[PDB]
Amino acid sequence: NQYYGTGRRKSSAARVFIKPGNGKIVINQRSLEQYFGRETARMVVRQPLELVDMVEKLDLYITVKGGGISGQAGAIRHGITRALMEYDESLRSELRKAGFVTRDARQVERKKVGLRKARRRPQFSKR
């Protein structure tokens, strides 16, 4: 069986497809440790799992494309939240109420002619 989840966030999408099994997470056929996961956002991946019960409900295979690390974590969270709603909307009410399904559209703004960056113009010329 499968749970429907795509998880679009910050140019990152993760195919969260959960099957019965252990709560362990396999990322790129590998675990989080030898994936060298003590980098940034080292604990945020279990925050969505911190409040909900683990038991024997979640075993998923995940691939993540795009972004850095916060992009990866956001993709994981959005995909698992999208896969989570199989248990009716009773969970989704509090999932939204706690901001667990937060999707932010704060993408990059295009570079502008005349400004060397997003909002920085040349230092104002002499009076």
């Binding site: 940034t40 604990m43 945020v44 279990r46 925050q47």
Partner: protein, 151 residues
Amino acid sequence: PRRRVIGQRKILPDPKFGSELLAKFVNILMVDGKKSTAESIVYSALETLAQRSGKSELEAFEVALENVRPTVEVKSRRVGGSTYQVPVEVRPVRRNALAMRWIVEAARKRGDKSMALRLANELSDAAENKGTAVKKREDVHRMAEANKAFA
């Protein structure tokens, strides 16, 4: 800066403690968008302050925050050419933020080799109102007590 509103914004906390106060401390301790090393030094400082204080880490943190706490200030307006300021009780959120930034600047006032060691030592000796930022708190208090002559 005259038409906008205030939405009481909030950003990512540390999941271990899960406190908005500690969230704001760690998020203002951030520099140039640095997450791993900044949080590592934060936890190093927290564990070292717990070790040196001996009491519970969170209550020692609260005692330190109470120690650094200032009370009142004024704002410069330049009305009559002399110091003509109405002492306004600063906003509790703004008071908290100013205390945060005074602690951070007191930490910043050194140039020590190791950031973790310097941070731990200074915050630990500032936890019992005998470190670095309490002098700034006393100086701010001295800035008061005299601005009430003009109201």
